[PDB]
Design a protein around this nucleic acid. Structure first.
Ligand SMILES: C[S@@+](CC[C@H](N)C(=O)[O-])C[C@H]1O[C@@H](n2cnc3c(N)ncnc32)[C@H](O)[C@@H]1O
Ligand SMILES: [Zn+2]
Lengths: 81, 107, 82, 93, 97, 96, 86, 107, 93
DNA sequence: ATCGGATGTATATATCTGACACGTGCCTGGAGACTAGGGAGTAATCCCCTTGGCGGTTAAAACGCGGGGGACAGCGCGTACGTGCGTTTAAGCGGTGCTAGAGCTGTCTACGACCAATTGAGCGGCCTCGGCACCGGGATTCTCGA
DNA sequence: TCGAGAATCCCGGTGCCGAGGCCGCTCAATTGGTCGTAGACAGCTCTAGCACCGCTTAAACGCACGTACGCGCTGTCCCCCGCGTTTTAACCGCCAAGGGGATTACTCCCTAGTCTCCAGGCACGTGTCAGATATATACATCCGAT
């Protein structure tokens, strides 16, 4: 019950069910605090998660997914989509 | 590691041959010690490594491979220590740090 | 020929194009004569020390390094030209 | 004529930290003129410390104290420790 | 028509020009401005073509470093304009004149 | 008999601009130097003409800041300096 | 003999001593918040000078911050001080 | 005029013996020319003469014979082209130039 | 042992232009320290200027072109004329 | 406009003091003679780069217009900085003691200058190709009058 | 709180040259030797910095108070932004030409180095004189009341 894939280009994904980094663990919130631009490092594209705003000490990060909203935020759409 | 090319004896990539020449026919003091160009070539390695780490770091954000001078001002002015070191300087054809004073931003 | 009033070629948008890089929002129109009274003051200091480094070297050409030594004199520097 | 530079020596440090990227020829002349500026501030300052104390030698101790005068804060502490790491490879081997 | 409000051609052209490198003063009114000021010190001086651009880049990056200092000195008086009683402040603070 | 708000100050200025003694006292300033120098070494011993050279160079800088605090507080059309005036004069000069 | 960790000697730069430095600058009315701001700007100026003033002695292998070394510390920051030699 | 003491051959009051010593064991260049300490001792005569003209000039205005350091700052800061030369400097125990900003003066 | 000064060579030029006027001991130390500072500005600037043209000699021509850089304006037009007067009166005499 | 105090400020003696201008001794750094020598001047070539011109093309400046908002004056409030009066609490001082460190002398060992004898990394030159300029479709989105 | 609008973003294809990779090739790097001398020792003398104490009071400290200045809130008008249309000179890409920079090659004369000399000027001991407190005073700016 978790969508542990990703997309680099439309042909291939980055799975994160069994393998992966610690980068998978951050969840959805419709208000963003992180995005992930796709950069290329030496012919193959890693996926790198920057920040948008000044995140504080132990301030829980967000991420938009852009394909309910259990964040508890009001200023959001009530679903994922 | 090696015997020739003193940099390789020290483990640097900057020449200790050229730096020991440029401490004598630059006329800085009478008699430069033998350890002195080694220490100086290591520091000039490290500050060049500290810039070109941060330069290509913000080359990746731009998404370009090679480093243009615009990436160097973004590596220098974004970093406080480097900024202090390069306080007076102007990097040619290098833009500015993108900021607006936030009074001027709209309501 | 001996020229005058070339400083009005630093034209009214080109002061305001420069001022946007400084990040200013509204520019009162009296600025455009104060700024040309500042660029002429600044270029008199740089070129007179740039001519002096050629006059010592017995030349008739202000080369590229002789501005960079004239900028390193006043407390600026220029990385990029030598 | 032979006008030397630090052109190839910066290039061997760019192909250590970022081994795929390149560098423009304008941003080579900045790093060629960066190294030519931190030289004259380190050997410029360590030609006063070996003159105020009536010494006559730039030893390897003044280039330590030149670096702790110029370089601010945590670039001083890392470049000092990059120095003595690299002069001790020189003295032993 | 579709009228842009007074204020957001400015805050577009701030974010355009701060995200760009290239020269903002045209070169031919700077090639003939430098040769005016050199003609009062040594007559018939040629200029190397790099040594115009070394003067342009050190003057474009001086006036920008001036206009970042008037705009702190203008916001200080609760304004958003910049007047020439600001440039004559931000030079007097910095010890220019 | 409770002369006016403001003109004790202009009698206080013309006294102090026409005099040249040192304004911060000697013994509290000598304990400030021996407090700040504890971070950089322990048990230092200041030669006692180098707690004059840290005084006449420091209050000739604090005076030179208040001459540039006052020029920007006049610029905001008041006669009262404030801490949003000082941090302009340090920022425009390039101490930040 | 006595291990005194000295703290709050900054409060000896007194409120009627920042008034008289204000007067020699030629300023008229001082706020209430200047007095805990000038001490923030005094402790920044003394930290930069003494850290260089110690370094000049620590290199010279002494335990005295002599007045040649305070003058050299001020000369490096571009505030030369005439009156003690150099 | 004389033969010994090269200042007296030049007509200066500053020593050209000491200045020619301090251009060799100060390590400024390799080989200092013979005319070079003469020209330098004349300039250091003239700038000392220009200050001590204006210093004792403003000692007669405050009516004292000898010059205290307060007279030196009044000679330096009142000048128009010695203030540019001694721009950075602080003259120790020397006061300031007496001025008030004229907005603060009364009605 | 002995510490040299410019104390006496100031003192003759004080009695030259103000022949009744004395000086203090604190305000001699400023005029001692001022002469040492105009030295290391001029001989500093006339050393880099020897290096930039790749000569190795501080001749009289450099110190004409180092006074003309540091000294601002009307002091430059005087102290050049006060120099070349005194380099003729050394050479011709 | 101007009074009435009035009160600190700047204008005159007094006279003591310890800062300074001065007089003896000496010593070390400056002056001359002259030596070899290399660094700079002075010719010479030579060709690279700057000055000049022009014929385009057109981005960009110059100008004028409306309209909008930001500057600036005014006014009123309320608060907090100044003024002083009264009162503490160190600073300054001078004085004596004490000693940790600064300075100097002198030995004496390591070590950088310098020389030649060798050479191999580094610069210049030449090929080459891919990273980015440079434009087109569309998708978002960023504002604003609906 | 939004649908038309438009600038930006972005992703694409096609082309350019300038970054990168080598081929030869010289001079600068290496080194392996001498050579004295600079710095590194201990060592010693001494002086200057630190610790303390008693005092004397100048200056900080606190409070009360009233007053003027900051601030905020207005309205105004002016002047700066926005934009369309016309205008003009920047730009690019030619041309060509020659001045001056750059190097080479003799040549020479200035100066570095060494020695021989000696008095300039350094520190010291000296009296003395221009100060700064110590003191009453004539009057400039300031103030409550008129
Ligand atoms: C992409 S994975 C996120 C990583 C996962 N939550 C973890 O920490 O292992 C998707 C998971 O996030 C949760 N999720 C998706 N949208 C969410 C939202 N808007 N608020 C809270 N949780 C959300 C879902 O339950 C789903 O299992
Ligand atoms: Zn939510």
């Amino acid at each position: 019950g978790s969508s542990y894939l990703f997309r680099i280009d439309e042909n291939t994904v980055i799975d994160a069910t069994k393998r992966g980094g610690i980068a998978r663990f951050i969840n959805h919130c419709c208000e963003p605090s992180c995005t992930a631009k796709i950069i290329k490092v030496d012919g193959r594209k890693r996926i790198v998660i920057y920040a948008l705003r000044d995140i504080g000490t132990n301030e829980e990060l967000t991420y938009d997914y852009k394909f309910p909203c259990l964040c508890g935020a009001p200023s959001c759409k009530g679903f994922l989509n | 590691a090696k015997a020739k090319t003193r940099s390789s004896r020290a483990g640097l990539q900057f020449p200790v041959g050229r730096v020991h020449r440029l401490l004598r026919k630059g006329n800085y003091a009478e008699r430069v010690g033998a350890g002195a160009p080694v220490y100086l070539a290591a520091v000039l390695e490290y500050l060049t490594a500290e810039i070109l780490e941060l330069a290509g770091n913000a080359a990746r954000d731009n998404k370009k491979t090679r480093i243009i001078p615009r990436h160097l001002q973004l590596a220098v002015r974004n970093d406080e220590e480097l900024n202090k070191l390069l306080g007076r300087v102007t990097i040619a054809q290098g833009g500015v740090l993108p900021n607006i004073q936030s009074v001027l931003l709209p309501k | 020929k001996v020229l005058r009033d070339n400083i009005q070629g630093i034209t009214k948008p080109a002061i305001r194009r420069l001022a946007r890089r400084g990040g200013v929002k509204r520019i009162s129109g009296l600025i455009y004569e104060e700024t040309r009274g500042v660029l002429k003051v600044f270029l008199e200091n740089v070129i007179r020390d740039a001519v002096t480094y050629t006059e010592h070297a017995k030349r008739k050409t202000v080369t590229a390094m002789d501005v960079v030594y004239a900028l390193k004199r006043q407390g600026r520097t220029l990385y990029g030209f030598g | 004529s032979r006008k030397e530079s630090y052109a190839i020596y910066v290039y061997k440090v760019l192909k250590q930290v970022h081994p795929d990227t390149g560098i423009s020829s304008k941003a080579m002349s900045i790093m060629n003129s960066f190294v030519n500026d931190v030289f004259e501030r380190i050997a410029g300052e360590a030609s006063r410390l070996a003159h105020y104390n009536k010494r006559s030698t730039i030893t390897s101790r003044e280039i330590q104290t030149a670096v702790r005068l110029l370089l601010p804060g945590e670039l001083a502490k890392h470049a000092v420790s990059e120095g003595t790491k690299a002069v001790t490879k020189y003295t032993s081997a | 028509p579709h009228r842009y409000r007074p204020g957001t051609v400015a805050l577009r052209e701030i974010r355009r020009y701060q995200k760009s490198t290239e020269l903002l003063i045209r070169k031919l009114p700077f090639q003939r401005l430098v040769r005016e000021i050199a003609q009062d010190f040594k007559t018939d001086l040629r200029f190397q073509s790099s040594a115009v651009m070394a003067l342009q880049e050190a003057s474009e990056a001086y006036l920008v470093g001036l206009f970042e200092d008037t705009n702190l000195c203008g916001i200080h008086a609760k304004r958003v304009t910049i007047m020439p009683k600001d440039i004559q402040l931000a030079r007097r603070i910095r010890g220019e004149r």
